[PDB]
């Protein structure tokens with residue numbers, strides 16, 4: 001857990017180069033599960049305003 | 050001679066390297082892992 005990656009240098013490098021099903025699934029799921037879930041309550045308010 | 054015995058006893062102590070090679074390597078690995086966990090562990094806000 002001391003190896004955190006951002007999106008630009010390092011997540012969409014896995015997604016562009018890798019050929020490992022499990023690593024691609026990990027990156028895809030975790031980006032949407034850890035950062036995507038923070039934007040839901042903000043987007044719901046953004047829509048209304 | 051107690052002086053000679055003191056020096057030889059300081060020099061004769063095996064310390065590590067009494068273990069196997071697998072066991073010694075595993076020990077060094079967990080030592081380094083614990084040190085690195087302590088040195089670079091991070092906690093962050095519950096609201097940011």
Ligand SMILES: *[C@@H]1O[C@H](CO)[C@@H](O[C@@H]2O[C@H](CO)[C@@H](O)[C@H](O)[C@H]2NC(C)=O)[C@H](O)[C@H]1NC(C)=O
Nearest residue numbers: 050051052053054055056057058059060061062
């Ligand atoms: C062996 O033990 C003797 C005494 O038990 C040591 O003799 C001493 O030697 C140092 C220098 O070598 C002197 O300054 C002391 O005065 C000596 N002590 C006595 C009581 O005579 C001897 O040094 C020891 N062996 C070694 C290699 O150190």
Ligand SMILES: *[C@@H]1O[C@H](CO)[C@@H](O[C@@H]2O[C@H](CO)[C@@H](O)[C@H](O)[C@H]2NC(C)=O)[C@H](O)[C@H]1NC(C)=O
Nearest residue numbers: 057058059060061062063064065066067068069
């Ligand atoms: C230090 O470790 C060695 C093994 O790595 C122990 O085993 C003795 O080693 C000497 C030197 O080769 C042999 O002559 C003996 O036959 C070995 N077996 C014994 C003494 O039972 C050694 O005993 C250890 N020394 C200490 C002080 O722990």
